[PDB]
Amino acid sequence: KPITFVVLASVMKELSLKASPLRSETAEGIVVVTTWIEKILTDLKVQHKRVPCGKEEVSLFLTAIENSWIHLQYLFKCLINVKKEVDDALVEMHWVEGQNRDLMNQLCTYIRNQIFRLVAVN
DSSP, X not given: OOXXXXXXXXXXXXXXXXXXXXXXXXXXXXXXXXHHXXXXXXXXXXXXXXXXXXXXXXXXXXXXXXXXOSOOXXXXXXXXXXXXXXXXXXXXXXXXXXXXXXXXXHHHHHXXXXXXXXXXXX
């Protein structure tokens, strides 16, 4: 029952350019996006590994840590799929293990937010 968000085929094009401005047309669109999610996660010192996936997607398995303390610690687990849907990229995130399922939305909203900061490279 996964959270999703599209990356538009133009946002991909801009992510490719950022991945190599001085060259062109190197790698698939979903692959480029995935390696930008991989950049975003390592920067958070989130652990992740690419896992076997389907023919028309790339998958990250990731392990983040959460802390639940009192009155303003634990490990949670997610599968990110980056699948080519229509012309654009569909990003699915599946909650696998952990306490607060709503931390996925926090991580997903963050990642997708991080993507669009990168694309404002204008």
